[PDB]
CSV table of C-alpha atoms in Angstrom, one decimal:
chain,number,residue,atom,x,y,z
A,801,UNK,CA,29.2,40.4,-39.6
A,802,UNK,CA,28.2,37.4,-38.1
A,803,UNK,CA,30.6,34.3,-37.9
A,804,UNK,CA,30.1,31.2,-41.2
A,805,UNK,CA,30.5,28.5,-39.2
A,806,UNK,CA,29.1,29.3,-35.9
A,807,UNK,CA,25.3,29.0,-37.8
A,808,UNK,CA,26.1,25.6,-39.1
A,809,UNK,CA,27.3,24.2,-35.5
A,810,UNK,CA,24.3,25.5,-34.0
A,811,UNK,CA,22.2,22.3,-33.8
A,812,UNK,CA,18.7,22.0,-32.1
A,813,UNK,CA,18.0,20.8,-28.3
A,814,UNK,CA,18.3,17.2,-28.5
A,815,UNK,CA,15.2,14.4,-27.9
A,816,UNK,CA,13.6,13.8,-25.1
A,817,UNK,CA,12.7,10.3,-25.3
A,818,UNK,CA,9.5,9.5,-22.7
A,819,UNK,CA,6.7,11.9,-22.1
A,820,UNK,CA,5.5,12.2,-18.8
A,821,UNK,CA,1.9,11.3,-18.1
A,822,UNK,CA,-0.4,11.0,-14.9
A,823,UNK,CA,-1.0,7.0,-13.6
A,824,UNK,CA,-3.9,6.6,-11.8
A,825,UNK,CA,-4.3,4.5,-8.9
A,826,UNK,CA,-4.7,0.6,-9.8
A,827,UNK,CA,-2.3,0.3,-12.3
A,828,UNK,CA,0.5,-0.8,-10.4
A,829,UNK,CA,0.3,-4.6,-9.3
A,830,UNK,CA,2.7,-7.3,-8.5
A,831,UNK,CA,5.6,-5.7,-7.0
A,832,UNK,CA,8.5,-6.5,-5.0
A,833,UNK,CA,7.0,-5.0,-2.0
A,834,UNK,CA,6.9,-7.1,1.0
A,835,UNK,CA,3.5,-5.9,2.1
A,836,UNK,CA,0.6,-8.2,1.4
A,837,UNK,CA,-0.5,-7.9,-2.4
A,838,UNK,CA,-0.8,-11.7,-3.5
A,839,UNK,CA,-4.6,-11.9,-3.7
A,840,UNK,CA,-7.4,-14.5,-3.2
A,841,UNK,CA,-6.7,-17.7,-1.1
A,842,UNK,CA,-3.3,-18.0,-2.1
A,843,UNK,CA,-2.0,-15.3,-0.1
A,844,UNK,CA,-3.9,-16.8,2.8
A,845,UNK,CA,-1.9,-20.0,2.0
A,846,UNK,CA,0.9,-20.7,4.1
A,847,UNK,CA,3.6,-24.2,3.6
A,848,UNK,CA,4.4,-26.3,5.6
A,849,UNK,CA,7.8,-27.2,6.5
B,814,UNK,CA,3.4,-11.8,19.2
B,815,UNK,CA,0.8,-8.6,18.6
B,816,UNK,CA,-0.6,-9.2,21.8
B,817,UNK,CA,-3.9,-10.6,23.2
B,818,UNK,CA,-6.3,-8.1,24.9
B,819,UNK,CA,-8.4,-8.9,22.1
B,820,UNK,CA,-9.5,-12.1,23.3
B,821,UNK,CA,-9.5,-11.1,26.9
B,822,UNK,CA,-13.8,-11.4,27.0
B,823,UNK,CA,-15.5,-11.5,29.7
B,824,UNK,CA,-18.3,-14.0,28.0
B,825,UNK,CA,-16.5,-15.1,24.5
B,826,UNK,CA,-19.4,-17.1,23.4
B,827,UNK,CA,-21.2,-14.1,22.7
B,828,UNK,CA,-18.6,-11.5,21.3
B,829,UNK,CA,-16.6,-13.7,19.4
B,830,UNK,CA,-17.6,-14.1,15.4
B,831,UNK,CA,-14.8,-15.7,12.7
B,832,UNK,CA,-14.9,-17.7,10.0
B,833,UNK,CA,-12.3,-19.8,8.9
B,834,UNK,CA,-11.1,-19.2,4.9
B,835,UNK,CA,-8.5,-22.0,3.5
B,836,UNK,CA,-5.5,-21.4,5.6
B,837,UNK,CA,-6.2,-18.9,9.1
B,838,UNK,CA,-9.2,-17.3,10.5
B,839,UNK,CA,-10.3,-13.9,11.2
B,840,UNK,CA,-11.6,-12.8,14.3
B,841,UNK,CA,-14.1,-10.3,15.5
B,842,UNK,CA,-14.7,-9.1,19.4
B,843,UNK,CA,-18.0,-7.7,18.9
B,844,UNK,CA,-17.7,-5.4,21.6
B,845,UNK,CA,-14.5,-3.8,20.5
B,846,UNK,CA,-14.9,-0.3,18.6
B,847,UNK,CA,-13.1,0.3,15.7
B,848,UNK,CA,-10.8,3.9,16.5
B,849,UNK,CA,-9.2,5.5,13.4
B,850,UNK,CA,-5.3,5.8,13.7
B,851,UNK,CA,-4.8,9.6,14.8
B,852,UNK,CA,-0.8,11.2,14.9
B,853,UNK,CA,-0.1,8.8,11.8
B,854,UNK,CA,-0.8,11.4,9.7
B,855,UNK,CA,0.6,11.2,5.5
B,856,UNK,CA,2.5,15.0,5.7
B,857,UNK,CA,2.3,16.8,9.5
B,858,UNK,CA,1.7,19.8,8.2
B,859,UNK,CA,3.1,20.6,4.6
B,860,UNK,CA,2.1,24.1,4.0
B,861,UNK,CA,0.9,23.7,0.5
B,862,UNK,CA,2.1,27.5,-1.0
């Protein structure tokens, strides 16, 4: 005979708020990784002290 | 600190190439084969199934 309530409280799953998507190579640039990505002659550049 | 073995030449004149961009220079033994890095492989084995 079913319950009056228990359909109202019933509520749909909630949101998912980012979609997942594929990133191809390139993209990424300028992180904190210590490995050599400065570019051009700056890298190359080293101060003096 | 790497190590020199590189340098060690017989006749450097010869087998030594570099050119100098703004801060350090890169340096080619001519004679010295370039060997892919074997047993530094991305996954051993991972059985993909």
């Amino acid at each position: 005979k079913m319950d009056t309530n228990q359909i109202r409280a019933v509520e749909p799953a909630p949101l998912t708020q980012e979609v997942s998507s594929v990133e191809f190579g390139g993209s990424s640039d300028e992180t904190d990784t210590e490995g050599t990505e400065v570019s051009g002659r700056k890298g190359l550049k080293v101060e003096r002290d | 600190p790497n190590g020199s073995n590189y340098i060690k030449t017989a006749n450097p004149r010869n087998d030594l190439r570099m050119v100098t961009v703004a801060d350090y220079t890169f340096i080619v033994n001519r004679n010295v084969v370039a060997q892919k890095n074997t047993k530094s492989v991305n996954l051993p084995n991972y059985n993909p199934n």
